[PDB]
Amino acid sequence: DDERQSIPSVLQGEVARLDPKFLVNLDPSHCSNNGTVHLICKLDDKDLPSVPPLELSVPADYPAQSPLWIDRQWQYDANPFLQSVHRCMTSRLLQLPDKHSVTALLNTWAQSVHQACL
């Protein structure tokens, strides 16, 4: 009894049922066995897009702040608007108790990106 064919089923099974507003794909495979996910998402809706997240998860206990903003500094200091957007996002994240990268993180990110227009 072992997978031997793909990533943990629960994660892909749950994210596969998300909205079509998002788009998931894979980066260079640096999370082959343990991370099992390196996703890039681009919000496609009636709002301005932004830099995609990293989305690297941990085992199903999910104490995982999957995105870490590798390109935070320059890509977010490029413009003040998206900088304030990022600030609002970060302020909203900490209130989430035991957030879930699969649903909660992306949902809050989309909510903040859509509220960005104030």
């Binding site: 260079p28 496609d44 301005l48 897009p49 830099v51 390109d71 490029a78 413009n79 998206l82 227009c117």
Partner: protein
């Protein structure tokens, strides 16, 4: 054909400048062909503009280079023949944005798109070589200092060195022409501009010359120990 009325509508009004992304996505098929994006709008607008910085558009340029086709932007800012005009006002902003663009890293294209972008940035460096020529007179060194500084900056090792090597091993004539232009620029730079000037340019020239030399030159030293290998084998 839609791009014409699109850019007309864009410049015609002072929009929120962030709702532009939404307006474009709505007005465009959102994935038909992104080769008709803002990539060429900047140049086709600045052509007629000439001696004008064309504000309110650099914001769009930034909101594009945030996440768009970096390759097209690169090739189009490379082939931009502004050295002849030498406005020193728009090309200044161009080099400024190119600095932060090339600072961190490029993106993946899952193809030889990376090599194409490398050839593009090589042509862009060739273009930058004319900065000292456009600043030789300077009767009406500011641009020269910044241009040579960005030249020195772009030479971060272990990041682009292999890419430049690949580019040089993919075509030679362009590289030989760039080297000849560098030699000519160094020769024309034989005037006593300043202490820092005409001195660091030679350093960048030697660095460019060493670019195709090798990537793993043996620079170790302080090996104070009699090697018994040769002794024993002999």
């Amino acid at each position: 054909v839609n791009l014409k009325q699109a850019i007309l509508q864009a410049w015609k009004e002072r929009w929120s400048d962030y709702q532009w992304a939404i307006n474009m996505k709505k007005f465009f098929p959102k994935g038909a062909t992104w080769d008709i994006l803002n990539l060429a709008d900047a140049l086709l607008e600045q052509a007629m503009i000439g001696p004008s910085p064309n504000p309110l558009i650099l914001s769009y340029l930034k909101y594009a280079i945030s996440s768009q086709m970096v390759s097209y932007s690169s090739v189009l800012t490379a082939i931009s023949k502004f050295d002849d005009f030498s406005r020193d006002l728009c090309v200044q902003a161009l080099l400024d944005i190119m600095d932060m663009f090339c600072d961190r890293l490029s993106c993946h294209g899952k193809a030889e798109e990376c090599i194409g972008l490398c050839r593009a940035l090589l042509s862009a460096l060739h273009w930058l070589l004319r900065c000292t020529a456009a600043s030789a007179e300077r009767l009406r060194e500011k641009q020269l200092a910044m241009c040579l500084q960005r030249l020195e900056k772009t030479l971060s090792s272990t990041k682009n060195r292999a890419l430049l090597h690949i580019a040089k091993l993919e075509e030679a004539s362009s590289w030989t022409a760039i080297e000849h232009s560098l030699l000519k620029l160094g020769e024309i730079l034989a005037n006593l501009s300043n202490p820092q000037l005409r001195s660091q340019a030679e350093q960048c020239g030697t660095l460019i010359r060493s670019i195709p030399t090798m990537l793993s030159v043996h620079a170790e030293q302080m090996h104070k120990t009699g090697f018994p290998t040769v002794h024993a084998v002999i």
